[PDB]
Every structure is written in structure tokens, then in C-alpha cells.
Amino acid sequence: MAIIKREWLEAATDAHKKLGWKAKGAVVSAHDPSDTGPDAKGYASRHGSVVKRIAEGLLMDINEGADWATSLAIEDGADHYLWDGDGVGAGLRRQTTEAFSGKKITATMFKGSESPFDEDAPYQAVRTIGDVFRNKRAQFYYALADRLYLTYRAVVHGEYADPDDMLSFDKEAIGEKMLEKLFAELTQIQRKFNNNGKLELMTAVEMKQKLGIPSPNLADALMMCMHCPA
Ligand SMILES: [Mg+2]
Ligand SMILES: [Mg+2]
């Protein structure tokens, strides 16, 4: 039921170097403020299709966490910042917008439980996005999975893909230790049964209680980065 293969992640490591392309596009950053306020938090940032930072935020309350993540977004030259507002982070917009005052950084609250973005559009790669994905959490985790798989096929099978549809991990920028932590979380993200035939993922609470796996905040942070707001 896992949606991402470890082999894809290994292939995607330095894929831009292996295949000879450079990051192009906006810088997108996202923050997972943890489930519960004080536990481990996540941040991820990419420049176009190249992931450049994966960071954990430790021993912080919810407000310290948002200060940390928004400061990283500033350091990373983000054009767009997202954060998970479906839970304990639902009240962070004022602090977030204060942090970005005077800077050209958009702030978007991500709510994974919402219906998918652009849900009446045709599904690509009479069936619409909303017919395929239950919600944004599924939509954007599969956006990630699709990028990774296409990257794997390009790197390992020599099948051309547009870099804009791929995802590379800049290992030197991110650091080996944090990259490994991210990967160990990403391979735990799992599909669950859905009674309307839609793609749906296990929630963090389910992952915890059913399988004993801790909240995948780095994975979630990266997933949210897949949505570029505008
Ligand atoms: Mg969350
Ligand atoms: Mg989370």
C-alpha cells in the first residue's frame, strides 16, 4: 500500500546532476507544525524541480516553530510559503504574514482534508481530478510520487521526461542525514481503502495507532511544497 518506492528516491538523489539540468522556477517552501503543538516539526524547500532544504524543528512550541519555518523561507528566498492549517496550525496566518511583512512571499494555508485543487479539471497521466483523489493530501502526495517515478524512469531506464515534471534531491545542499530521515518517512506513506473508489492516504493518526509510525512531518512538508499557489 506504500505509494513511494525507495529506489525512486535513490534515483532522484542528484538526478539533476545525473541528467544534466538545473533548477528553474519559483522557490516554494512549506512547513508542517506537527500534530500536537510541541513535537517535531518539518520544513521543506525547492527551487523548481530541485529540493534544496529539508529541516526538522525540535523543542519548539507552535509559535516558535512558525518563526523558525518562516525565517527559513526568508533565508531560502521563497516566493511561496505553505503550512498545514488543518490542525494545530489553523491559527498561524497572522504570525506568518507578520513574518513576511515587506517581502514578496505569499502565504497559503494548506488543508489536506479539502477536496482537490482544480477538481473539475480532467485527470491527466470524462474522469476529473476530483474523481481520482479524495482530497488535497492525496492529490499532492501523488504529485510527489508521480514526479519521483518519472525521475526514476529517466535516471534508471533512460526514458526522457521534462525536468519540470521530475524531482531531484540536491544531496549536498540538503545533507545526507536529513535526506535519509526524509526518505524513511516517505516510504511509510500509505494508501487506504476508500468506499468511493478514490485515492486516499492513511492519516498520521492512523499511521501511529495502526502501525506505530511517528508523524511524518518532513514528508508532509515536502508534499505541501508540490502545490505552487499562483
Ligand atoms: Mg500536519
Ligand atoms: Mg503532518
> How many Å separate Cα 179 from the centre of its chain?
13
Place of cell 497559503: 108
Residues preceding gaps in the chain (C to N > 2.5 Å): 125
CATH of the domain at 80: 3.30.420.240
- Give dist(CA 225, CA 42) in Å, integer: 12
Q: Answer yes or no: are the C-beta atoms of 217 and 56 closer than 8 Å.
A: yes
Q: Answer yes or no: are the C-beta atoms of 28 and 50 closer than 8 Å.
A: no
> How many Å separate Cα 45 from the centre of its chain?
9
Q: Answer yes or no: are the C-beta atoms of 100 and 81 closer than 8 Å.
A: yes
- Give dist(CA 41, CA 29) in Å, integer: 14
Residue ranges with CB less than 5 Å from ion ligand 1:
32, 84
Report which of 23, 28, 22, 24 is spatially closest to residue 230, judged by C-alpha positions: 28
Q: Answer yes or no: are the C-beta atoms of 223 and 140 closer than 8 Å.
A: yes
Sheet holding 106-110, edge to edge: 106-110, 80-84, 27-32, 41-47, 50-57, 168-169
- Give dist(CA 24, CA 213) in Å, integer: 35
What spacing in Å lies between the alpha carbon of 161 and ligand 1's midpoint?
Answer: 31
What spacing in Å lies between the alpha carbon of 202 and ligand 2's midpoint?
Answer: 12
Tell me how the structure was determined: X-ray
Residue ranges with CB less than 5 Å from ion ligand 2:
32, 217, 220
Closest listed ligand to the CA of 185: 2
In terms of DSSP bridges, do strands 41-47 and 27-32 run parallel, antiparallel, or are they unpaired?
antiparallel
* Region of residue 183 (phi > 0: left; psi between -120 and 50: alpha; otherwise: beta): alpha
* Range(s) of the domain holding residue 172: 1-230
Q: Is 84 annotated as a binding residue?
A: yes
217-224 and 136-157 helices cross at what angle (nearest 10)? 90
- Give dist(CA 89, CA 111) in Å, integer: 10
Q: Is 35 annotated as a binding residue?
A: yes
- Give dist(CA 207, CA 201) in Å, integer: 10
Q: Which residues pair with 107 in a beta bridge?
A: 81
Q: Is 79 annotated as a binding residue?
A: no
Q: How many domains does the chain have?
A: 1
Q: Answer yes or no: are the C-beta atoms of 30 and 224 closer than 8 Å.
A: yes
Q: Is 194 annotated as a binding residue?
A: no
